[model samples]
Target: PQITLWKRPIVTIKIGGQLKEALLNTGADDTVFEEVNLPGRWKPKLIGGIGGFVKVRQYDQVPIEICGHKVIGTVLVGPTPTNVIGRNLMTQIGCTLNF
Candidate 1:
């Protein structure tokens, strides 16, 4: 049987001073953020991915607060459309998809 799930508050990324809400998807293997939303101060670097490689900038330890839990090393910056929540953050904060 299939069960419908209730949405939870996801941790958001503050890019270019704008907040973009995203799902914390542990199923993803790498940490990625929205490209368009990235701040001007952050620069993009070429990185390797499943499709070989792409340009992306990394934010090593970003402070993030979720569900009243303040977590450092939570955010990683990258491009969008395929913006994903990766394993690094997942391992830090135990996560499970629920309804």
Candidate 2:
């Protein structure tokens, strides 16, 4: 499906078997959630956004469903209002950026 960038490309997604909304970020590198109760161990890592760098917990091989498309990969738990589905998972779902 073709999506325009005029507005945020937010979509319904399922993570850890729970339904949630997230932004399909074409420029972001890793998928991240502001807050969650995902079950597993995670490593502390740092990620930089437009504002500044933030510490995040990295979880690997997590199952996620994006618009019904399923893909398992790395997801980050961190501080951010909007949950983001970044390029890592986006590529798995074959999302492309176009003008």
Candidate 3:
């Protein structure tokens, strides 16, 4: 499927066996999600976004199914307004930037 940049590239993804919505953000270096329950141990980490930096929980090797493609990677839980699927996971699914 092809998507245009005029609107936010939002899609449905399954993370930690939970169905959720996320934005395919090509410019983001890391994947961040709002408040969501994930099973496993996490360490505290700080990540800077548009305005400033915020402390978040880092969950490693978490399984997520994006567009029917399952991938195991790192997912950050934080105070973002929307969940973002970044390059760390996108690259696994072969999502590349193009005109």
Tell me how candidate 1 scores on lDDT. Answer: 0.56
List the global CA lDDT of all models: 0.56, 0.87, 0.89
TM-score of 2: 0.87
User: Which candidate has the top score in lDDT?
Assistant: 3
TM-score for all predictions? Answer: 0.55, 0.87, 0.90
Models sorted by TM-score, best on top:
3, 2, 1
List clashing residue pairs in candidate 3: none
Off by over 4 Å in 1: 1-18, 35-45, 48-52, 96-99
Residue-by-residue lDDT tens digits, candidate 3, 38-97: 998999998885597789999999999988888888999988888999999999888888
What is candidate 3's local distance difference test score?
Answer: 0.89
How many clashes (backbone N, Cα, C below 3 Å) per candidate? 0, 0, 0
- What would the per-residue lDDT of candidate 2 be over residues 8-92, giving only the tens digit for each residue? 8899988876789999987888999965778888899978955977888999988888988888889999877899999999989
Q: Which runs in model 3 stand beyond 4 Å of their true positions?
A: 49-52
lDDT of 3 at 41: 97
lDDT of candidate 1 at residue 12, scale 0 to 100: 56
